[PDB]
Write a protein that binds this ligand. Sequence first.
Ligand SMILES: COC(=O)[C@@H](C)c1cc(OC)ccn1
Ligand SMILES: [Cl-]
Ligand SMILES: [Cl-]
Ligand SMILES: [Cl-]
Ligand SMILES: [Cl-]
Ligand SMILES: [Cl-]
Ligand SMILES: [Mg+2]
Length: 344
Amino acid sequence: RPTFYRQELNKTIWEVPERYQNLSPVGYGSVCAAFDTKTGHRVAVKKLSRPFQSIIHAKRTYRELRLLKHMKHENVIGLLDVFTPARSLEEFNDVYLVTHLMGADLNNIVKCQKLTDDHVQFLIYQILRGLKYIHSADIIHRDLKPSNLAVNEDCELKILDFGLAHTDDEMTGYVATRWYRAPEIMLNWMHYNQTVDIWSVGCIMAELLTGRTLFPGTDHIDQLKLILRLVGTPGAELLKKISSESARNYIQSLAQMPKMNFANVFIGANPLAVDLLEKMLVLDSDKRITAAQALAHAYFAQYHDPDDEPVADPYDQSFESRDLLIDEWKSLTYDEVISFVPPP
Ligand SMILES: COC(=O)[C@@H](C)c1cc(OC)ccn1
Ligand SMILES: [Cl-]
Ligand SMILES: [Cl-]
Ligand SMILES: [Cl-]
Ligand SMILES: [Cl-]
Ligand SMILES: [Cl-]
Ligand SMILES: [Mg+2]
């Protein structure tokens, strides 16, 4: 066990190992920037807020720790360390998570840069490379958007901030929290799956090509109208897959519209980029291109290497259907803190 030291920083007590120095507040938890003397990295240290206050919160704490401990890929955020100052389960209360300190996100470049087609190729390639890995473990990210993508000076990218299961108020009105969501999840049409993440990638790629949000709806219904104008209204085949009779009735109340010509929407774009967008932005999720298929599309010919696009170790999510008491979720979390082994 390392030696810990205590300090109060902005109304919060932080008790951390001596290896972490020069803690400075930066913003579910409070976060400090620090220098990690063991690795030489600048890190983000997050102290979880009330991690075990309810059954729901305790299970969410376990879910987050399990997911971060599993992710080991160049294009996905990983876990550098996890610690508690507690010496036993009896006194266990606080959980701290340590990751690489990230600088700019894809907003801090999409708004502030001139991107060549080569830049778009490399950024989208890296998102899809990380997504192939994520999806191979049967994980769905659910919240892909520019603020959840970290990018450095060399245009290298990492996916972060996995969806841990966003509120009703957060999805309401003219908000970026909804502009990247697939229509079947935005309107609760059907049980969703990993194909929702590919819709999000299409929305991101379009914005890198044009500099503008693809579907900036003022509310759920306005956003659906923008979507259907581009991709067309559904046919009977997709309508059969929508579970709610009212939702089907609402859709059938709209006048039918054909899919638009994407070359006349994304004026001047690389024809191979236009082709890939038509394969991602498909209303019926069953018919969208997958991450593994998209990596082999000709748009990425200069970056695709099928011997350097790895998959994940199997990920057991059976805990998600398990019913446990607060202290049982807490004990499982404690076991995962104690068993952590750092990366090389
Ligand atoms: C059974 O199939 C349908 O009802 C399809 C042809 C349909 C889709 C609509 O999307 C606006 C509106 C009206 N009718
Ligand atoms: Cl230490
Ligand atoms: Cl990382
Ligand atoms: Cl503690
Ligand atoms: Cl965003
Ligand atoms: Cl009509
Ligand atoms: Mg975020």
